Design a protein around this ligand. Structure first.
Ligand SMILES: [Mg+2]
Ligand SMILES: [Mg+2]
Ligand SMILES: [Mg+2]
Ligand SMILES: [Mg+2]
Ligand SMILES: [Mg+2]
Ligand SMILES: [Mg+2]
Ligand SMILES: [Mg+2]
Ligand SMILES: [Mg+2]
Ligand SMILES: [Mg+2]
Ligand SMILES: [Mg+2]
Ligand SMILES: [Mg+2]
Ligand SMILES: [Mg+2]
Ligand SMILES: [Mg+2]
Ligand SMILES: [Mg+2]
Ligand SMILES: [Mg+2]
Ligand SMILES: [Mg+2]
Ligand SMILES: [Mg+2]
Ligand SMILES: [Mg+2]
Ligand SMILES: [Mg+2]
Ligand SMILES: [Mg+2]
Ligand SMILES: [Mg+2]
Ligand SMILES: [Mg+2]
Ligand SMILES: [Mg+2]
Ligand SMILES: [Mg+2]
Ligand SMILES: [Mg+2]
Ligand SMILES: [Mg+2]
Ligand SMILES: [Mg+2]
Ligand SMILES: [Mg+2]
Ligand SMILES: [Mg+2]
Ligand SMILES: [Mg+2]
Ligand SMILES: [Mg+2]
Ligand SMILES: [Mg+2]
Ligand SMILES: [Mg+2]
Ligand SMILES: [Mg+2]
Ligand SMILES: [Mg+2]
Ligand SMILES: [Mg+2]
Ligand SMILES: [Mg+2]
Ligand SMILES: [Mg+2]
Ligand SMILES: [Mg+2]
Ligand SMILES: [Mg+2]
Ligand SMILES: [Mg+2]
Ligand SMILES: [Mg+2]
Ligand SMILES: [Mg+2]
Ligand SMILES: [Mg+2]
Ligand SMILES: [Mg+2]
Ligand SMILES: [Mg+2]
Ligand SMILES: [Mg+2]
Ligand SMILES: [Mg+2]
Ligand SMILES: [Mg+2]
Ligand SMILES: [Mg+2]
Ligand SMILES: [Mg+2]
Ligand SMILES: [Mg+2]
Ligand SMILES: [Mg+2]
Ligand SMILES: [Mg+2]
Ligand SMILES: [Mg+2]
Ligand SMILES: [Mg+2]
Ligand SMILES: [Mg+2]
Ligand SMILES: [Mg+2]
Ligand SMILES: [Mg+2]
Ligand SMILES: [Mg+2]
Ligand SMILES: [Mg+2]
Ligand SMILES: [Mg+2]
Ligand SMILES: [Mg+2]
Ligand SMILES: [Mg+2]
Ligand SMILES: [Mg+2]
Ligand SMILES: [Mg+2]
Ligand SMILES: [Mg+2]
Ligand SMILES: [Mg+2]
Ligand SMILES: [Mg+2]
Ligand SMILES: [Mg+2]
Ligand SMILES: [Mg+2]
Ligand SMILES: [Mg+2]
Ligand SMILES: [Mg+2]
Ligand SMILES: [Mg+2]
Ligand SMILES: [Mg+2]
Ligand SMILES: [Mg+2]
Ligand SMILES: [Mg+2]
Ligand SMILES: [Mg+2]
Ligand SMILES: [Mg+2]
Ligand SMILES: [Mg+2]
Ligand SMILES: [Mg+2]
Ligand SMILES: [Mg+2]
Ligand SMILES: [Mg+2]
Ligand SMILES: [Mg+2]
Ligand SMILES: [Mg+2]
Ligand SMILES: [Mg+2]
Ligand SMILES: [Mg+2]
Ligand SMILES: [Mg+2]
Ligand SMILES: [Mg+2]
Ligand SMILES: [Mg+2]
Ligand SMILES: [Mg+2]
Ligand SMILES: [Mg+2]
Lengths: 63, 84, 50, 99
RNA sequence: GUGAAAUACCACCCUGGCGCGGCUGGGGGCCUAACCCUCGGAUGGGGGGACAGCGCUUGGCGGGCAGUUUGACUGGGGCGGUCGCCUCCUAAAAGGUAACGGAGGCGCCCAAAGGUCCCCUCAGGCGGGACGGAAAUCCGCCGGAGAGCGCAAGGGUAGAAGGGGGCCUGACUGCGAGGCCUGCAAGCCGAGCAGGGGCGAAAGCCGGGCCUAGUGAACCGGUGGUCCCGUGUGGAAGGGCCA
RNA sequence: UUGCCCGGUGCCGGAAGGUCAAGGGGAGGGGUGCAAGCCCCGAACCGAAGCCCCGGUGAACGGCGGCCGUAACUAUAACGGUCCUAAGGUAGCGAAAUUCCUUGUCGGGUAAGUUCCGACCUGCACGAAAAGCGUAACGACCGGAGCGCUGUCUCGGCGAGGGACCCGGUGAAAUUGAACUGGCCGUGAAGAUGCGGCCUACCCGUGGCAGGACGAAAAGACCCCGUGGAGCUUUACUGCAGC
RNA sequence: GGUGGAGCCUGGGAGUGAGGGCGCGAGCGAUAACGUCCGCGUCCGAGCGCGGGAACAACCGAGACCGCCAGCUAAGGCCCC
RNA sequence: AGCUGGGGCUAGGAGUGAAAAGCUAACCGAGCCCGGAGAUAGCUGGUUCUCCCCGAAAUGACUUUAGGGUCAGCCUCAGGC
RNA sequence: CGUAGGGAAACCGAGUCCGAACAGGGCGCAAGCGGGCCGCACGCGGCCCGCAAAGUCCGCGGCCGUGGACCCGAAACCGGG
RNA sequence: GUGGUUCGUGGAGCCAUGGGGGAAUCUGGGCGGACCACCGCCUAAGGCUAAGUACUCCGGGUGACCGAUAGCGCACCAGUA
RNA sequence: CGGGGGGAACCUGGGGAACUGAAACAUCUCAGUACCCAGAGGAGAGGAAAGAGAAAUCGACUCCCUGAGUAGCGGCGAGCG
């Protein structure tokens, strides 16, 4: 019956216009105590490939 | 059935391979940023138009060609002569 | 790290932060230092805890 | 996958997934470039736009997008800055509405 | 005079104790009339008695019972050992490369062991030397690095990364061309622009540390800010975003 | 007859103290209202068993290892000392249903005895009520010995009857890829009737034997694997009954 | 240079994640193992299709579309079988 | 502490047991029947007509993973270059 | 469903998000025509065209998800008898 | 203390209610997702009520349903032997 | 006067599993399902707002299609909705 939208996905990925899948970099959630600004700074979304193909299949209906 | 107590070891651990070495040989065209060499120490000194990173990481800063130069007891180098 | 203890740096002119590590025992206690803010940028910062 | 942590090592960014009563009854706005708007003439308005081939029940009308604004009156709930400009070449601006 | 400290007298108070009194708690005693048990049937008489029993709720004990969990590698399995990270070898002169192959380290640390400017150059060998081991510190030659560089090992290095002194906090904020490495995401190098600074006359150099270990995705929550959302409206509660 | 040790666990008793639930109490603080207010947060302190704690208790769970020194050779140690634990085996037993070394060593019985019986005590690892040590009588219990008597045996023989054999009658079974199904050396997935080379060998039965057809039967009961299952245990986890 | 069931890009369908022998370079082992673990190569696997090697997955020869009572060769052979 | 007929009672985490986990209708560490139910089975087995073209893998990383998997490597088909 | 993409969001919009920044950078957009005909402006309008800008709908086929999901097989668990 | 709802303690309202305490009669009382103030919505603690909907033992009508190992377990004197 | 039993499914109410799924497992899932019981009938239930929730709105209940795999719930896991 009507396939279901994986809400665990719907909560960490925004699927783009060209079809690419986007999510936030992993790291800076609590890791830190002293990481270069460069590292803690360089965290603002990214690509994924062959793996997002899989992602998109879970976000069916919500296109 | 014979399996008398079997001894043991320990020194069975190694480190990850770092894939170091020269990444671009002379004659090769390189854009600014292209990290030519990636040694650990100073095996290769930075030449004209070359930059050294935290880990003596040599990187070109000019869009041109590559080339080394042996200065003997002065240490080797690797400058990227500009595509002029 | 038990003795080092990681603290932050407040703008004193208000809020802000940056955060580093100390070393209570080893020549230390109370950290004052020049740090560039974001909420105006150009001031002195003290320790704190968080 | 199977055994090890799957690309679920990711991380909910989507700040705000919702409280318990749910979604908040909010007015949604659907843009429709004057580009398309220049398909017919007269005095285009919502409803006349939904019935056309754009908008449809998606609530409030907001004209803008590229395209060359046509000399005529256009009624909307909103207009983009650069859209309002384009209607310079003799057009309209019956904004507000909803009363 | 003794002592650590001085005593008449004067106070402000403290320690602990006893009384009389409010506030709050415990545990007995007597009563009968609820409840309980009894008397050749009793609207009654005995006995227990607001306890016990029973309802709701607190915490406890609780294999009597119930559902489950008790890792992998592995010259079978068990026992022992091991499990992530760093250095060297094995590795066959690019990179990579296995075994319960060989040999050692890490789970920190430094506010100076950081930034910059200016000076300085070692270890040993041989002389000569007050205490002086065979190295304390000296003096004279000779000595390109064998010394030093926080700690393993390797690479590197005095034309300094080593040793000393002065101001300093770039152990920046906003980014980030272009790359190394790579199944995934992670790791890594980073010129350059902007904001506001540090040192230098200046050229300039500074986005921690000679370098390669000193580490941990997500989820769940905490604390600062944000003012983004906030269930008819306003504010709140509660979230989000940044740290 | 039933020692020694109450430290720990259990059980019994215990109004000093430590900690601990609901609830009480509310210094103080917060959200909104123009306000009375209406909602919340919340520090002292008061709040049961329970655990801790203190005493006892062994025919309660249990524990009774060791290490030094010491007597008219030597050995031993009645005698002292020692301790992580609370204390370090009283009697009696003892190479025993218990002794690893072990066929211990002496003695007995035998021509010869890893067994047996009696001893010694170096008890790997007896011990007092999961009792110690004995004990007349009892036992289809297990050991060792004699006498008697034997086809047990040397070492077989014959005899009998019921089958087996043959005829008439009747008439199954497991098993079965198909078969035109021999030996030796080899070879082959390491053990071939089936490959090679050679040897042997007319065709078909009947009574017999059991070496092979890795013969039959049972999808190995041992072993490992499966994030399989059940029964059982506990100071594994989490609940529950019950108190 | 090289037109090859070569390459590159995008997408649909996979299967495979027990390998094995030989040669050479190392470890382990005892420079023992039809041993074991890596490295390049090659065959078997999937070429138990064909010739040679007496027989014989992987040694030597050689990549089987079908037919022929024709021919030349390969390894290995040319006394008889 | 005997044996035995007839009449009765106790049962599935339950009974009964001079105790073996014995016995409870010829297999009891949890009876039998029907049902949930086509339980689950990362395991074993089996998987049926013909021809033509191409043609693997048994590696790496991670995995309560190690005879199972996900991504990559290698095969195939369509389109593009 | 499709005709707007961005943002966590308010929101803005061919832009948008981070940022003080017209620095940068992450997502984004930027679609005609091979072309017969012909009204017969020395102009190609625009009818037409593939099927696109570009999508949808229905049919068919491959694979995937949820269902017993290729078929047969447990030891067992639970309910009522 | 719990159940119901998408809501598993959550900022947890709403509807039911086992326990304890315990009102008012429209100048009342419940609700609009903690709570408060506004603005609104609705009248709890009494009962009844066709139609539209569900099913198929039974009768009928149809079938790109079966055709005696199929189709119901039973085409037959079958829930029988 | 009535009641009692029977009735294939269907219906309401009172009670209410487990295997499974989460590639172990306990919250969660399976599922208020299977099943037991009581009741009712050709149906049963529900039913005229102490409703919905933002609309100067609708106006009993039931049933179908959408809304929507949305809003939300969730060891924010499986999955539920
Ligand atoms: Mg930032
Ligand atoms: Mg949709
Ligand atoms: Mg640098
Ligand atoms: Mg009475
Ligand atoms: Mg009385
Ligand atoms: Mg009385
Ligand atoms: Mg009472
Ligand atoms: Mg148990
Ligand atoms: Mg279970
Ligand atoms: Mg190499
Ligand atoms: Mg090499
Ligand atoms: Mg300095
Ligand atoms: Mg990357
Ligand atoms: Mg509000
Ligand atoms: Mg107030
Ligand atoms: Mg006997
Ligand atoms: Mg005879
Ligand atoms: Mg006969
Ligand atoms: Mg043979
Ligand atoms: Mg033969
Ligand atoms: Mg033959
Ligand atoms: Mg015969
Ligand atoms: Mg015989
Ligand atoms: Mg045999
Ligand atoms: Mg190819
Ligand atoms: Mg492909
Ligand atoms: Mg393998
Ligand atoms: Mg193997
Ligand atoms: Mg292997
Ligand atoms: Mg191979
Ligand atoms: Mg291999
Ligand atoms: Mg090979
Ligand atoms: Mg070898
Ligand atoms: Mg081998
Ligand atoms: Mg070999
Ligand atoms: Mg291997
Ligand atoms: Mg081949
Ligand atoms: Mg061959
Ligand atoms: Mg063969
Ligand atoms: Mg051959
Ligand atoms: Mg041959
Ligand atoms: Mg060919
Ligand atoms: Mg010839
Ligand atoms: Mg020849
Ligand atoms: Mg009798
Ligand atoms: Mg049972
Ligand atoms: Mg039962
Ligand atoms: Mg009993
Ligand atoms: Mg008996
Ligand atoms: Mg029993
Ligand atoms: Mg029986
Ligand atoms: Mg059982
Ligand atoms: Mg089921
Ligand atoms: Mg089955
Ligand atoms: Mg099955
Ligand atoms: Mg599987
Ligand atoms: Mg081919
Ligand atoms: Mg794959
Ligand atoms: Mg092609
Ligand atoms: Mg941009
Ligand atoms: Mg089956
Ligand atoms: Mg039952
Ligand atoms: Mg609930
Ligand atoms: Mg609730
Ligand atoms: Mg109540
Ligand atoms: Mg009440
Ligand atoms: Mg109410
Ligand atoms: Mg209420
Ligand atoms: Mg209310
Ligand atoms: Mg309401
Ligand atoms: Mg409200
Ligand atoms: Mg209302
Ligand atoms: Mg009413
Ligand atoms: Mg009424
Ligand atoms: Mg009714
Ligand atoms: Mg009715
Ligand atoms: Mg019907
Ligand atoms: Mg039939
Ligand atoms: Mg027939
Ligand atoms: Mg019939
Ligand atoms: Mg039949
Ligand atoms: Mg009736
Ligand atoms: Mg029902
Ligand atoms: Mg019910
Ligand atoms: Mg029911
Ligand atoms: Mg379950
Ligand atoms: Mg499971
Ligand atoms: Mg449910
Ligand atoms: Mg009717
Ligand atoms: Mg009705
Ligand atoms: Mg009707
Ligand atoms: Mg009414």
């Amino acid at each position: 019956p009507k396939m279901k939208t994986h809400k665990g996905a719907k909560k960490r990925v925004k699927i783009t216009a060209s079809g690419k899948v986007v999510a936030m970099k992993t790291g800076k959630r609590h890791l830190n105590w002293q990481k270069s600004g460069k590292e803690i700074r360089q965290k603002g979304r990214k690509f994924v490939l062959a793996k997002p193909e899989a992602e998109r299949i879970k976000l069916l209906l919500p296109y | 059935a014979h399996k008398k107590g079997l001894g043991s070891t320990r020194n069975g651990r190694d480190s990850q391979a770092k894939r170091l070495g020269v990444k671009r040989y002379e004659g090769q065209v390189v854009r600014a940023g292209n990290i030519l060499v990636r040694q650990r120490g100073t095996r290769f000194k930075p030449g004209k138009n070359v930059g050294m990173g935290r880990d003596f990481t040599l990187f070109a800063l000019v869009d041109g060609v590559v080339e080394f130069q042996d200065r003997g007891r002065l240490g080797r180098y690797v400058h990227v002569r500009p595509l002029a | 790290v038990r003795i080092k203890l990681l603290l932050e740096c407040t703008e004193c002119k208000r809020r802000n932060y940056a955060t580093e590590k100390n070393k209570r025992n080893t020549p230390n206690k109370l950290e004052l230092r020049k740090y560039c803010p974001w909420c105006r940028k150009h001031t002195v910062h003290r320790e704190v805890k968080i | 996958e199977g055994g090890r942590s799957t690309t679920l090592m990711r991380l909910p960014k989507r700040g705000m997934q919702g409280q318990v009563p749910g979604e908040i009854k909010r007015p949604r706005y659907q843009g429709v470039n004057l580009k398309d708007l220049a398909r017919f003439e007269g005095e285009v308005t919502p409803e006349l736009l939904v019935r056309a081939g754009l908008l449809k029940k998606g609530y409030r009308l907001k004209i803008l997008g590229e395209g060359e604004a046509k000399p005529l009156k256009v009624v909307a709930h909103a207009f983009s800055k650069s859209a309002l400009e384009k209607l310079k070449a003799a057009g309209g601006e019956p904004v507000l509405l909803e009363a």
